[PDB]
Design a protein around this nucleic acid. Structure first.
Ligand SMILES: [Mg+2]
Ligand SMILES: [Mg+2]
Ligand SMILES: [Mg+2]
Ligand SMILES: [Mg+2]
Ligand SMILES: [Mg+2]
Ligand SMILES: [Mg+2]
Ligand SMILES: [Mg+2]
Ligand SMILES: [Mg+2]
Ligand SMILES: [Mg+2]
Ligand SMILES: [Mg+2]
Ligand SMILES: [Mg+2]
Ligand SMILES: [Mg+2]
Ligand SMILES: [Mg+2]
Ligand SMILES: [Mg+2]
Ligand SMILES: [Mg+2]
Ligand SMILES: [Mg+2]
Ligand SMILES: [Mg+2]
Ligand SMILES: [Mg+2]
Ligand SMILES: [Mg+2]
Ligand SMILES: [Mg+2]
Ligand SMILES: [Mg+2]
Ligand SMILES: [Mg+2]
Ligand SMILES: [Mg+2]
Ligand SMILES: [Mg+2]
Ligand SMILES: [Mg+2]
Ligand SMILES: [Mg+2]
Ligand SMILES: [Mg+2]
Ligand SMILES: [Mg+2]
Ligand SMILES: [Mg+2]
Lengths: 123, 129, 80, 151
RNA sequence: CUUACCACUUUGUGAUUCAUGACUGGGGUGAAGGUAACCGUAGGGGAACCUGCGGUUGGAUCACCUCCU
RNA sequence: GCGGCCCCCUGGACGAAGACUGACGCUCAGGUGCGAAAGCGUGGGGAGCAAACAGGAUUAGAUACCCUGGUAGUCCACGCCGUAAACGAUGUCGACUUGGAGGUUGUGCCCUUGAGGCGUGGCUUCCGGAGCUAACGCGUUAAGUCGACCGCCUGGGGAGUACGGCCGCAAGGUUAAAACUCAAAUGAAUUGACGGGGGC
RNA sequence: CCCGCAGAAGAAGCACCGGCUAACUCCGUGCCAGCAGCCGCGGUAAUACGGAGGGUGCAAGCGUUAAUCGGAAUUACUGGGCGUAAAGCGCACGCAGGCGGUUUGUUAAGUCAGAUGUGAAAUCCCCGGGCUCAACCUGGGAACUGCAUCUGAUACUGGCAA
RNA sequence: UAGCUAGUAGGUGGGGUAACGGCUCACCUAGGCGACGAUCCCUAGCUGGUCUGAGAGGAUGACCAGCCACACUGGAACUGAGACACGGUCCAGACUCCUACGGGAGGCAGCAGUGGGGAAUAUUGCACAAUGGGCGCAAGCCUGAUGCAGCCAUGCCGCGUG
């Protein structure tokens, strides 16, 4: 309030932590999957939230969402995750990058091919 | 306790002309009359006067144009809490120069426009549009 | 003519020395309230002449102890 | 208590062996977001796409035979590197691998130890902790998970 | 050749810590009825709830189907 | 917080009229002090009241509900605790700014004074003007217009919790987290369902 | 760098098109799924999912992620609050501290004015110059708000005196 | 994280240094320092600047320039104008290496480059023509400084794909 108070104690800049800790500011962080699993939404909706359990290189073991379909991943697959989060499923703050060297790119995609590594069709 | 005359001089004007009074009185002092006259000498107040012997009374005459108070905003900038001083090049502006700022330059208390012509910096007393 | 600086003596207990608290009053970097800032300067006082709380003028010289690099030119007031 | 877990295992045994897959890992825990986890031990490879076919099959049978006090939160799951093993078939296949085992009635010097399997019995397992092979009775052990060597 | 200094070391003796890890404080946890709300405290005790004292009014609950200027 | 009467000890406020000193002031981290009730220590004391408890009445079960008991306590002495919706949910000091109604305690004047008429203070209650406010409202006792200084807030939960420190005999208090969790939480008012009510 | 040669000849893609936000239809689709930055989207009609046409945006790039500042007046110096939304300690006294009526004199500390010194170059900015343009490079200047010292000025603040 | 400190604060004397000085000794005194935050733990090379912002700010310290510190780890001096010395010396240690096993040798945080780490970062190039630096009368010699090239849409700017 009164500056005399501020000179006694100035305006502390409100600290703000990052929302993606297992990244440590590296825009991508590879890790090896440990167990994949789908989970069921509650009674009203039936769906397969595809997420997998992955230990990071730096021991941060976390789960990563598996976007798209036709992925042939299973335990020991060595994938690469990146920032971003899904509002519907809690506890998922990371998504893999489709078209990773271990990942097999989603097949039969004719649009948004940069978000899946689906190369320009030879045509 | 009271710790600033000028502030109380100002608000007495503000709250005074707020009540649309005719003329508001307060104990006199050099700075005050020094301040007060600059208003009239600028046209902010009609006129003022000092009354009593061994007792300080300042009675200044306000003014209204078209039923509207001639002064509308008056803010003491330099406060007894925090003091404010500005170099000549840096003397502020009020409403793009439509308003006047009272600055206590070393030679004398005066208008910031005159102070810029005098090329002198001073303590910014207050603002008035 | 010479750089000189005046301070009040916090202590004279030191043998042939004095502790002088000099006050300097400043615009404040963020806000602008002028606050007093004091330095516990160690000062060489010959004769153990001064007394605690006196006001005194001081000038700097070649360093003389681990902490004393200043000596007193003269005293302003006295009889504290 | 088993919340009809054997009955639920019988209910979900028919679909898991229906699309041919292999059943391990029955678990359920009620609470906020109450959830059960079902594991498919696929020798070919537990892709979530393979899991997807099993998951639609198990939900379709499950809705008619909804479990008592169990919400619809199934986790069709790959048994990870730290898959939990409860039957002696596991430790049988898990011949010489380490496992961490915790039991219900905790006591001083209880069998809460992590070590390598050397022998397998129907109600007992021999596992090398304390630097010596020691008897473990899975009768009191309600939780036990196979461990890969790591850092 | 010896004196002082002193790296490393060793002995114990501690602390500060950093992990690993056996073990334990605790957020979530798998009907006869009498109903303002509350606060401080005490006791009943699974706890809660009710009761004891004193204080306050803050002296009601609920709500889901479209437009171009 | 204070409630019979009387005495003894004493603090503070107000007014009238001067006289007096000569800015001696305001705020307050730290700091001491006071501090409802309950509780604690020791000794009391003991009517009434009454946690707990005891009994009587009453369903998976009496339990709760009610009686009838009833201990601690409630009181005193001296310690200890230091928290309350300790709230006006409004820090302290000053100055300024429309009114009407009151209560209350002064005191001047003047009617013939009682009365009554004029005044002029302090405290206090209530409307309500400008104003301000998210609104409700507040509105010369401002939540208005200003000043000086201090305390304090920074989404909700987690949590006034953990740890540590400090205080206490304890009870505990004070100081005060984070992990994690949520996309809200909340304030006022607006319109409608309550109501199955209440009246016509 | 110039001159010649031949011939359109060797050289376009990513994203998006429910809202925010520029840009819409058709079939799929059957809560299967997907989509997601969020609000939200989805069933017999889905401009929000897949595909096709069509369109927008950029462009040898276009996107996504990370990351910092901005937006955020959301630590509010500039520039917030504290009757009920988070927030006035239970109350008081009081040291340190902060602040202080009025008049004159003095002081010159604050402050202001000037001057000198310094504030590396680059960078920034102005006015140029040079690369065919541009980036880039470069001349000169400005600026570097500071600091120190000397001279000042005395209204205010402070000090000192009354 | 509230106390901190005994060569500690000061003094005398001696020594010591290019020079001041608890620099160090001898003694003398018993101070000094802290809420204007000592002490402690934890984090961090600093600045010109860069980024962001209308500004104030906030964030930053990659490249270029200034300063500092470091050169396997620990310790030490020697020489020299200048070193307690990156491609110098000695001791200790770890490691690697050689061995005749007796002992020895070694230090890419120079330039390339390898391994590894990692989401991820290049050539074991040319030349000393220019500018610089060393030595030298000079000639000249040396120079992974530097000048150039290679690599990479990493960025900016320009142009084309009629
Ligand atoms: Mg499916
Ligand atoms: Mg009360
Ligand atoms: Mg009591
Ligand atoms: Mg009961
Ligand atoms: Mg008692
Ligand atoms: Mg309280
Ligand atoms: Mg007020
Ligand atoms: Mg899409
Ligand atoms: Mg801001
Ligand atoms: Mg606010
Ligand atoms: Mg509330
Ligand atoms: Mg509140
Ligand atoms: Mg004080
Ligand atoms: Mg003062
Ligand atoms: Mg004054
Ligand atoms: Mg420059
Ligand atoms: Mg330039
Ligand atoms: Mg040109
Ligand atoms: Mg004066
Ligand atoms: Mg000496
Ligand atoms: Mg650097
Ligand atoms: Mg660099
Ligand atoms: Mg030498
Ligand atoms: Mg060398
Ligand atoms: Mg080398
Ligand atoms: Mg290298
Ligand atoms: Mg690698
Ligand atoms: Mg050579
Ligand atoms: Mg290019």
């Amino acid at each position: 309030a009164t500056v005399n108070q501020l000179v006694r104690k100035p305006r502390a800049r409100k600290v703000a932590k990052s929302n993606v800790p297992a990244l440590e500011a590296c825009p991508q962080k590879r890790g090896v999957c440990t167990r994949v699993y789908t989970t069921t939404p509650k009674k009203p909706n039936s769906a397969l939230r595809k997420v997998c359990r992955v230990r990071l290189t730096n021991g941060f073991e976390v789960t990563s969402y598996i976007g798209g379909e036709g992925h042939n991943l299973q335990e020991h697959s060595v994938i690469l995750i990146r920032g971003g989060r899904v509002k519907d499923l809690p506890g998922v703050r990371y998504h893999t990058v489709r078209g990773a060297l271990d990942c097999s790119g989603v097949k039969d995609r004719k649009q948004a091919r940069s978000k899946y590594g689906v190369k320009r069709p030879k045509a | 306790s009271m710790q600033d005359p000028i502030a109380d001089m100002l608000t007495r004007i503000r709250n005074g002309q707020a009540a649309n009074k005719a003329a508001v009185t307060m104990p006199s002092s050099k700075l005050k009359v020094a301040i007060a006259n600059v208003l009239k000498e600028e046209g902010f107040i009609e006129d003022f006067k000092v009354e009593g012997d061994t007792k300080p009374e300042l009675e200044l005459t306000l003014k209204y144009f078209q039923g509207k108070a001639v002064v509308e905003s008056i803010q003491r900038v330099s406060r007894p809490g925090l003091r404010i001083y500005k170099r000549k090049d840096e003397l502020p502006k009020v409403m793009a120069g439509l308003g006047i700022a009272v600055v206590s330059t070393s030679k004398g208390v005066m208008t910031d426009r005159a102070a810029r012509q005098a090329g002198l910096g001073g303590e910014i007393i207050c603002y008035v549009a | 003519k010479i750089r000189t600086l005046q301070g009040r003596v916090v202590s004279d207990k030191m043998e042939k020395s004095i502790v002088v608290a000099i006050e300097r009053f400043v615009k404040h970097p963020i806000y602008g309230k002028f606050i007093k800032r004091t330095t516990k300067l160690h000062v060489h006082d010959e004769n153990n002449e001064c007394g605690i709380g006196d006001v005194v003028e001081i000038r700097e010289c070649r360093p003389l102890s681990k902490t004393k690099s200043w000596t007193l030119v003269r005293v302003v007031e006295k009889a504290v | 208590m088993s919340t009809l877990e054997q009955k639920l295992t019988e209910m979900i045994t028919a679909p898991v062996e229906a699309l041919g897959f292999e059943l391990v890992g029955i678990e359920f825990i009620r609470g906020r977001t109450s959830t059960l986890r079902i594991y498919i031990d696929s020798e070919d490879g537990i892709n979530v796409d393979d899991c997807a076919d099993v998951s639609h099959q198990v939900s379709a049978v499950l809705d008619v035979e909804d479990p008592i006090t169990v919400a619809y939160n199934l986790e069709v799951s790959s048994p990870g590197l730290d898959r939990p093993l409860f039957t002696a078939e596991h430790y049988a296949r898990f011949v010489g691998e380490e496992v961490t085992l915790v039991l219900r009635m905790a006591v001083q010097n209880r069998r809460k130890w992590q070590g390598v399997i050397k022998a397998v019995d129907g109600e007992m397992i021999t596992v090398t902790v304390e630097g010596k092979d020691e008897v473990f009775a899975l009768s009191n052990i309600q939780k036990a998970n196979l461990v890969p060597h790591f850092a």
